[PDB]
C-alpha cells in the first residue's frame, strides 16, 4: 500500500494536542498499512509522544469515527526533530459540510435500525447508513495520492 | 460586497454576502448565468420549501464556513438542535453545501 | 582525574554515530509521558541516562572511575529490570553495555 | 476580533459582521449601503435597549464570545416614515415541528 509507516527506526518526539471538542482517537498506520488505535485524548488535552520519522498518523472522533484534521490536513508524518526540538500535531475539527454535519447529529439521535422510519428522501437513508470509516477514507486518500504522480 | 436575498417559504427575507451565499452549489448555479454565458445574473432566490427557521440556520452555516475554512485559528463545532436536524439535513442536501 | 578523563573518553564512544543504532534509547532521560509508562518511577528507584552521566562528569561529581562505572551499570540494570528478557530495548542495552564493558576493562 | 450579527426588522434579516471597536453609527452605515436608508432614519436595538450612535459594539455588549459566526447576535431595526420612528417589530422565524419519536 502507498499509505503506511516507514520502518525508519529513527525516533521523533511529537506533541499530540487536541484543540477539538471531540474525544480524539489517534490512529497509527503500521508497516503493512493497517490502522492501529492508540489511547484517546480528552478534548483540550495534550501529551508528548515517542514516535519515529516516516510514521503515518490520522485522527478521529473516538465515539463516531468522524474524520478530524491535524495541522490543517488529514495525515501526519513527522520529520526528524531538528537538533532535538519536538514536532507539533495540532488536532482540530475540520469545517464539515452542513450535510455531513447534519448526518452526524441525526446519527447521534437515531438507532441505525430506525433511520428508515425518518420522513426523508430515500437517498438520505443511504447517506445516514454510510458511517465514517477509516478503511474507506484510506482508499479515498490512496487514489488522491496516486493522482499526484 | 454584493449581497443577495434568500426568501424562505414563509416570506422571510435573508440578505447575505454574495460570496457567502456561493457556499451553496445550488445557489451558485441559480445566481450564475444560464449555463456557460454569465449574463442576466439574478439577485434574488426564492425557496418554496425551506422555512425561515431552517434558512436562517443555513445562512449561519455560510458565515461559519467562510470564516473558519482555511483558518489557522482553532475551529469550533457547528451546533444543531435536534428539532431542526431533520429539516436542515434536507436543506443541506438540496443546497449542496 | 587522570582516570576521570578516560571515563569521559568512554562516554564519548557510547555517543558515537557507529553505536547509534542501539545507543539512542539511553541518550537522554526516560520520558515516562512520551513512552506512556504509569509505573516506571515506582519500579526504578534511581533512573539514569548517558546525558545525566555526562553532566555529572562535567560537575566533577564522580569521586573515582568506580563511581562512574556504577552509574553506567545502573543505567543498564534499570533497563534489564523494568523490561522482559525478550524485549527489543533489552537487546540494544546489552549491545551498548558490550561497548562499555570492553573500554572500562582496559583502564590502567 | 470580529462580531457577527443578524440585523432584523419585520420579515427582513441581514447577516453581516463588524469589529468590537466599530460604533453603532458604522453599523447604520452598513445598513444604509444594503437597504438604501440613511443612519438618521435608522434606530438600532439590543433587545429592548436603544443603542447610542456613539457607543462601540463592544461597549453595547456584543463580544466575539456572544456574537459568533455560527450563533450571531441580534440587532433590532426600526425605520422612520411620516417623520417619526415606527415601533421595533421583528416577526419571529417559523417553529420547527415537534421532535419525531425515533429521535427521542
UniProtKB/Swiss-Prot annotation, chain A:
GO MF annotation, one: transcription elongation factor activity
Record note on what altering residue 58 to P does: In VHLD; type I
Recorded consequence of changing residue 99 to E: In VHLD; type II
Impact when changing residue 51 to C: In VHLD; type II
UniProt effect for mutating residue 22 to P: In VHLD; type I
Consequence recorded when altering residue 47 to P: In VHLD; type I
Effect in UniProt of substituting residue 5 to L: In VHLD; type I
Span list, region Involved in binding to CCT complex: 40-95
Effect of residue 89 to T: In VHLD; type II
UniProt-reported outcome of changing residue 68 to F: In VHLD; type II
Annotated effect of mutating residue 54 to S: In VHLD; type II
Effect recorded for residue 138 to R: In ECYT2 and VHLD; type II
Function: Involved in the ubiquitination and subsequent proteasomal degradation via the von Hippel-Lindau ubiquitination complex. Seems to act as a target recruitment subunit in the E3 ubiquitin ligase complex and recruits hydroxylated hypoxia-inducible factor (HIF) under normoxic conditions. Involved in transcriptional repression through interaction with HIF1A, HIF1AN and histone deacetylases. Ubiquitinates, in an oxygen-responsive manner, ADRB2. Acts as a negative regulator of mTORC1 by promoting ubiquitination and degradation of RPTOR.
Family (UniProt): Belongs to the VHL family.
Record text about domains: The Elongin BC complex binding domain is also known as BC-box with the consensus [APST]-L-x(3)-C-x(3)-[AILV].
Protein name: von Hippel-Lindau disease tumor suppressor
UniProtKB/Swiss-Prot annotation, chain B:
GO MF annotation list: protein-macromolecule adaptor activity; transcription corepressor binding
GO biological process, one term: transcription initiation at RNA polymerase II promoter
SMART domains, alphabetized: Skp1
Known pathway: Protein modification; protein ubiquitination
Modifications the protein undergoes after translation, according to the UniProt entry: Ubiquitinated by the DCX(AMBRA1) complex, leading to its degradation by the proteasome.
Keyword Transcription (UniProt): yes
GO cellular component terms attached to this protein's record: Cul2-RING ubiquitin ligase complex; Cul5-RING ubiquitin ligase complex; cytosol; elongin complex; nucleoplasm
Subcellular location per the Swiss-Prot or TrEMBL entry: Nucleus
Similarity comment: family membership: Belongs to the SKP1 family.
Main function: SIII, also known as elongin, is a general transcription elongation factor that increases the RNA polymerase II transcription elongation past template-encoded arresting sites. Subunit A is transcriptionally active and its transcription activity is strongly enhanced by binding to the dimeric complex of the SIII regulatory subunits B and C (elongin BC complex).
Complex formation: Heterotrimer of an A (ELOA, ELOA2 or ELOA3P), ELOB and ELOC subunit. The elongin BC complex interacts with EPOP; leading to recruit the elongin BC complex to Polycomb group (PcG) target genes, thereby restricting excessive activity of the PRC2/EED-EZH2 complex. (Microbial infection) Interacts with HIV-1 Vif; forming an active cullin-5-RING E3 ubiquitin-protein ligase complex (ECS complex).
Protein name: Elongin-C
Organism: Homo sapiens
This protein's encoding gene: ELOC
Curated annotation (Swiss-Prot), chain C:
Cellular compartment(s): Nucleus; Chromosome
Expression across tissues: Ubiquitously expressed.
The protein's assembly and partners: Interacts with p53/TP53; the interaction is direct. Interacts (via CTD region) with CDK9 and CCNT1, acting as an associated component of P-TEFb complex. Interacts with RELA (when acetylated at 'Lys-310'). Interacts (via NET domain) with NSD3, CHD4, BICRA and ATAD5. The interaction with BICRA bridges BRD4 to the GBAF complex. Interacts (via NET domain) with JMJD6 (via JmjC and N-terminal domains); the interaction is stronger in presence of ssRNA and recruits JMJD6 on distal enhancers. Interacts with NSD3. Interacts with NIPBL.
Protein name: Bromodomain-containing protein 4
Domain Bromo residues, every copy: 1-107
Residue numbers of the full-length protein present here: 351 to 458 of 1362
Family label: Belongs to the BET family.
Domain of life: Eukaryota
Signal peptide: none
Function: Chromatin reader protein that recognizes and binds acetylated histones and plays a key role in transmission of epigenetic memory across cell divisions and transcription regulation. Remains associated with acetylated chromatin throughout the entire cell cycle and provides epigenetic memory for postmitotic G1 gene transcription by preserving acetylated chromatin status and maintaining high-order chromatin structure. During interphase, plays a key role in regulating the transcription of signal-inducible genes by associating with the P-TEFb complex and recruiting it to promoters.
Swiss-Prot record, chain D:
Pathway: Protein modification; protein ubiquitination
Record domain Ubiquitin-like: where: 1-66
Keyword Acetylation: yes
Gene Ontology terms: cellular component: Cul2-RING ubiquitin ligase complex; Cul5-RING ubiquitin ligase complex; cytosol; elongin complex; nucleoplasm; VCB complex
Protein origin, superkingdom: Eukaryota
Gene Ontology MF: a single term: ubiquitin protein ligase binding
GO term, biological process aspect, one: positive regulation of proteasomal ubiquitin-dependent protein catabolic process
Gene3D superfamilies registered for this protein in UniProt: Phosphatidylinositol 3-kinase Catalytic Subunit, Chain A, domain 1
Modified residues (Phosphothreonine): 84
Major localization class: nucleus
PROSITE patterns from the UniProt entry: UBIQUITIN_2 (PS50053)
Residues modified to N-acetylmethionine: 1
Keywords recorded for this protein, A-Z: Acetylation, Host-virus interaction, Nucleus, Phosphoprotein, Transcription, Transcription regulation, Ubl conjugation pathway
Protein location: Nucleus
Family indicated by similarity: Belongs to the Elongin B family.
Description of how the protein assembles with itself and partners: Heterotrimer of an A (ELOA, ELOA2 or ELOA3P), ELOB and ELOC subunit. The elongin BC complex interacts with EPOP; leading to recruit the elongin BC complex to Polycomb group (PcG) target genes, thereby restricting excessive activity of the PRC2/EED-EZH2 complex.
Protein name: Elongin-B
